Design a protein around this nucleic acid. Structure first.
Ligand code: DGT
Ligand code: AF
Ligand code: CA
Ligand code: CA
Ligand code: CA
Length: 341
DNA sequence: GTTGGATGGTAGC
DNA sequence: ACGCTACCATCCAACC
């Protein structure tokens, strides 16, 4: 079995470069008015002409400007990047029908029935990289291996404008050689739980007994890491389907006043209910982001679908429930809909 | 105590 | 990403 993972290089900035080639060779930074940094926003993506100097995703814009004060700072236009992406996914479909859209710029492909071995796979990659650049003028990185996870690590090693195959041997090498942290699904929090307890490779997970690993990172991550180290990881390429649609809005000032908050909450409903686009949810959750930036939520599932009026009415009840059960002022209010009929 | 689903949260991306 | 998925401990209703 063979998996090909495509990852679009610095996607949003790249798209902006395409929609405006004058920007090529200039440092380009795509900004978001993101969580922590509600003064000047944060870097969503930067091109390599900006990354070279350390301007990377998630750093505050106030810090970017200290590095590249003459760079181009662009508002992020997600709707544009979504279109372009979908056109690329279509191009990927013409190579394999078995595809898994992991995110706006990431897709897995099962190419087992398209190639005979890794030599031929590399060339398909080259063809794919060639097609995207041709049709969308976007450099992408291609990762090829025997499974999704390793295909992904491959692309991580070759970023940007790269291509890599991790053969069956190197897979065995990486199970012994690679830092556990660089495995997909392992972030800062989980790695601490592993680095503290002497687990730095995948192979280390075969040593430790299952229950103490379960009661530390969970049944899922445990089975997942065991499976990888044991070289038995065999997860099929499946179609992802949207499972929830939500929206969060920031208020002018922190509050606990229901009448002051209601309008922002209704804004969230209108906007997320519009997005449902013919889908009928059975669950509704209201989130509050509090003044200290902690996240709280109250939801309900119905034996039937939620009409926009039920959404309005239940929402108020859910936000009342938050207001009774949490003493903190609220900074952001939001809603999400799930369990579609 | 068990089973299925629901809840409010964690973690990663 | 102020958006989303998967997961988890716990809760809940109902129970031969
Ligand atoms: N809407 C939104 N998308 C974001 C934000 N930050 C990052 N993203 C998107 C753009 C990126 O493709 C991706 C960031 O994490 P990734 O590691 O998956 O990006 P990746 O290394 O694959 O390449 P990319 O960052 O272009 O260079 O998610 C944000 O604040 N808001
Ligand atoms: N980005 C984002 C948007 C909406 C929501 C989250 C993240 C988490 C959450 C939880 C409950 C309702 C809505 C949201
Ligand atoms: Ca990317
Ligand atoms: Ca990405
Ligand atoms: Ca990691």
């Amino acid at each position: 079995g063979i998996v090909l993972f495509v990852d679009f290089d610095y996607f949003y900035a790249q798209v902006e470069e395409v929609l405006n080639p004058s920007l090529k060779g200039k440092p380009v930074v795509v900004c978001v008015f993101s969580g922590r940094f509600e003064d000047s926003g944060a870097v969503a993506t930067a091109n390599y002409e900006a990354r070279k100097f350390g301007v990377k995703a998630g750093i505050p814009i106030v810090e970017a400007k200290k590095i590249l004060p003459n760079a181009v700072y662009l508002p992020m236009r997600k709707e544009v990047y979504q279109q372009v992406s979908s056109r690329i996914m279509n191009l990927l479909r013409e190579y394999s029908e078995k595809i898994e859209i992991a995110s706006i710029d990431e897709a897995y492909l099962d190419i087992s029935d398209k190639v005979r071995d890794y030599r031929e796979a590399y060339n398909l990659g080259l063809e794919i990289k060639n097609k995207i650049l041709e049709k969308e003028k976007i450099t992408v990185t291609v990762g090829i291996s025997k499974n999704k996870v390793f295909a992904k690590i491959a692309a991580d090693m070759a970023k940007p404008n790269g291509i890599k195959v991790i053969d069956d041997e190197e897979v065995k090498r990486l199970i012994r050689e690679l830092d556990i942290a660089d495995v997909p699904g392992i972030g800062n929090i989980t790695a601490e739980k592993l680095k503290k307890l002497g687990i730095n490779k995948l192979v280390d997970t075969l040593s430790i007994e299952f229950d103490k690993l379960k009661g530390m990172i969970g049944e899922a991550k445990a089975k997942y890491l065991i499976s990888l180290a044991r070289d038995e990881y065999n997860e099929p390429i499946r179609t992802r389907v949207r499972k929830s649609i939500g929206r969060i809005v920031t208020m002018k000032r922190n509050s606990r006043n229901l009448e002051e908050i209601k309008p922002y909450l209704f804004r969230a409903i209108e906007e997320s209910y519009y997005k449902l686009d013919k889908r009928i949810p059975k669950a509704i959750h209201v989130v509050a982001v509090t003044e200290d930036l902690d996240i709280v939520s109250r939801g309900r599932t119905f034996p039937h679908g939620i009409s926009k009026e039920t959404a309005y009415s239940e929402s108020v009840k859910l936000l009342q429930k938050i207001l009774e059960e949490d003493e903190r002022k609220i900074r952001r209010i939001g809603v999400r809909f799930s369990k579609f009929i």
